[PDB]
Amino acid sequence: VEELLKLAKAAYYSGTTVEEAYKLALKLGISVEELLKLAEAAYYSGTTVEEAYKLALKLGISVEELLKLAKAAYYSGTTVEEAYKLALKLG
Amino acid sequence: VEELLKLAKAAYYSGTTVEEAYKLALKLGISVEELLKLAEAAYYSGTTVEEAYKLALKLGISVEELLKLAKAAYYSGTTVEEAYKLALKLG
Amino acid sequence: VEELLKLAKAAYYSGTTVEEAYKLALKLGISVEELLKLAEAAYYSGTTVEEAYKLALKLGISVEELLKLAKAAYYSGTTVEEAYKLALKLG
Amino acid sequence: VEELLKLAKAAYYSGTTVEEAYKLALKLGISVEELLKLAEAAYYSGTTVEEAYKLALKLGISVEELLKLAKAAYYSGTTVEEAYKLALKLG
Amino acid sequence: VEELLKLAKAAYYSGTTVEEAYKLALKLGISVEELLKLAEAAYYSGTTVEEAYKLALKLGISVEELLKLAKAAYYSGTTVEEAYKLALKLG
Amino acid sequence: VEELLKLAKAAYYSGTTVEEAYKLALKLGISVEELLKLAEAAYYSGTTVEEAYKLALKLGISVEELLKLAKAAYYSGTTVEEAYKLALKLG
Amino acid sequence: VEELLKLAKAAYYSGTTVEEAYKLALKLGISVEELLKLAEAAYYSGTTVEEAYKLALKLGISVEELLKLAKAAYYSGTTVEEAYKLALKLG
Amino acid sequence: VEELLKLAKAAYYSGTTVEEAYKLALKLGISVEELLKLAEAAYYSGTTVEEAYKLALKLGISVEELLKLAKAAYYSGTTVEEAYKLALKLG
C-alpha cells in the first residue's frame, strides 16, 4: 500500500494516473521511490518524467542529486543543465 | 495527559469535542492512537470515523493500512474502496 | 548563548524583556527551559507566566504536562483546569 | 550538488544570485555553510553578509554564536551588539 | 509572515505543500521551528518529518540534538541511530 | 553613493533605468531602501513596483513583510494575495 | 599571515600572483586592504588595478567610494565615470 | 553532540571514519576544533592530517595560521611552505 501511495504522489506530480505511472516505472526499469523523486524533480523543473530520467543519465548522476539540482535550479531561476554546468564551473 | 492530547488532536480532525471522542473510542473498543489514525483517515477521505472503521472491517484491514489507502485515494481523487481494488489489481 | 536565546523567546511569548524573564526565572527558582515551557503554556492559555507556574503546582504536575495540557486546551477550546478535570474524568 | 543547494539558499536569503554568493564566499574566504549561517544571521539582524562577518570578527566569535545572537536580537527587539552586551551583563 | 516563511522552507524541504506542513505541525503538536528542524533532519537522514519526530522521541532527545545527529550521520555515512550509539560509545 | 547603488540594484530588478527608479521613489514618497525591497518583491512575484506598493497598502503591511510574503509565495508557487489569505486562515 | 591571505584574494581577483600584487602595493603606496578593494573594483569594472587607482585620483575619491561606484556602474551597465557624473547629477 | 559533529566533518575531510579521527585527535593530543581545522587545511593542501600538524610545528605556528596559509596556498596555487616563505619574504 506504501508503493501505491508513492505512485499516487508521482501521479499527482506528473498530472497523470497511477497505472500510467506504474507502467512508466517499469519502462525505465526503476523503483517507485526513484520514480517519485523524478516526479518531484520534473515538477520543480517543468519538464516530463522521461526527460528528467534522460537528463539524469546524460549528466551521469543519481535521482537524488537530480532532484536537489532541480530544487536548486528552481530557487536560482534557471534550468537544471545550466545549474549542473554552474556546479562544475566552480568545482 | 498524553492520551488527552491525542484525543484533542483527534477532536481537531473530527471536528467534535474530546468526550464524544472518548465515548466513541469505547464504542469501537479501540485505543486513542487507533482513534486518531481513523480520524486522520476520515479527514483525508471525507467520511466519518465510524464509517471509516466500518470500511476498515469491510475490507478486512488494519487502521494504518486504511490510513495509507485514504491518502493514496486522496491524491488520485477516488474513494478508499477504489483504492483497495486498485491496490489488489496491480499486486 | 543558548540560554540567552531561550530567555529571548520566553520574553517574546510573555511580551516582556529578557531581563524581566531572567529575574522571573530567578524569583521562581526555575531553569530557562522550564521558563520557556511556562511561557509557551502561558501564551496558549492567554495568561501570564506566574499564573501558569502557580497552576502547575495547584494541579501538582510538571512543566511538560502543563504545556501538553495548554496545547490540549488550545485545541479543545477550554481552560487548562477544565482540561485537567477532563483528563481525570476519563482516567 | 549539495554545496550548490546551500549556495542557493544563501542566495535566496541575501536576495542576490548564486555566483555572486560564491564570489562572496571567496572574498571572505569562508565555506558555504558559514556563508549560509551569515546569511540567516544577516536576515534576522537586518544587515549584509559581509557586515555580519565583520561584526563576527569584531566580537571575536564564531558564526554560530553570531547567528544565535541575531535570533536573540530579533526576538528581543535589539541589535546584535546590545544582545552581546546583554550576554555578558548576565554572565 | 515569518512563521509562514518557515512553513514554506519546511514545505520546500519535505517536498510537500505549506498547508500540509501546517496540518503536519498540528498532527505532531509542534511549532513551525521544530517542524523546519525536523524537515532538515529528515533531509540529511533521508526520512520523513514524522519518522524524524518518532526517532526523536524514541531516543528521548530534542529536535536540535536530532538535527546534529542527522548531519553527523550524513557526513559519516551512517544512520541517525548508529550515530547515537557512536555518541554514547565515545562518551 | 550608497543610495545610488541601491537605486542601481532596484533598476536592475525592475529592468528600468536609475533615473526612472529615482523618480518612482519620489512619486511614492518612499526611501531607496523601501524601493529596493519593493523591487526584490516585485521581481520574485512577477509584477511591477507600483502594483507591489499598492498591494502593500491594500493589505496594510510594511515593505519587509511584503518582500517576505513574495519570497514565500515564490517558494509555494502562488500569488502574494493567496499567500496573505493563507497567512490569516491559519491565524 | 592575514595580509598574505588578503594578497592571495587580491591575486585571485586581479588574476596575477602574490609578489606582483605586493610590488604593485608598493608602487601605489597603499595598504593590502586598499589594494584588495581596488582589485574587487577593477574586477567589477573590467579594468586594471592601476587604471582603477588612477581613476580614483582623477575623480578625487577614496577606494571605497570608487568600489561602490564600480558596483553601481556594474548594475546599470555603464563605466565608473558615467556613474560619478550621474552620482552628482541626482545630488 | 557538537564535538561528534566536528569529528564527523573532520572524518569527511580526511576521508576516514569518526573513530579514526577521534583516535588521531588523542594521539596528537589536540581538541576537535584543532582537528577539524587541520582536516580542512589537509584537504586544501591535499595531504593527510598528520602531515598538516607536523607542518604546523615545523613552521612553529598555530592551527589558525596554518589554515589561513592553506587557503592562501589554495588561491595562489602553491604549497603551504612556499606560501610561508612568501609570507616571510614580504615581511
Side-chain angles (χ1 to χ4, degrees), chain G residues 4-5 8-9 18 22, chain H residues 72 76 83 87:
Chain G
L4 180 71
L5 181 49
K9 300 170 181 172
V18 186
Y22 179 74
Chain H
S76 57

Side-chain angles (χ1 to χ4, degrees), chain G residues 70 72-73 75-79 82:
Chain G
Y75 280 111
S76 57
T78 64
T79 60
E82 308 179 47

Side-chain angles (χ1 to χ4, degrees), chain F residues 4, chain G residues 59-61 79 82-84 86-88:
Chain F
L4 181 71
Chain G
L59 311 173
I61 57 187
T79 60
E82 308 179 47
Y84 180 63
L86 192 52
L88 299 179

Side-chain angles (χ1 to χ4, degrees), chain A residues 13, chain E residues 12 14-16:
Chain A
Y13 280 117
Chain E
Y12 215 28
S14 64
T16 71

Side-chain angles (χ1 to χ4, degrees), chain H residues 55-63 66:
Chain H
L55 193 58
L57 296 173
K58 176 174 180 175
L59 312 174
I61 56 187
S62 68
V63 288
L66 172 67

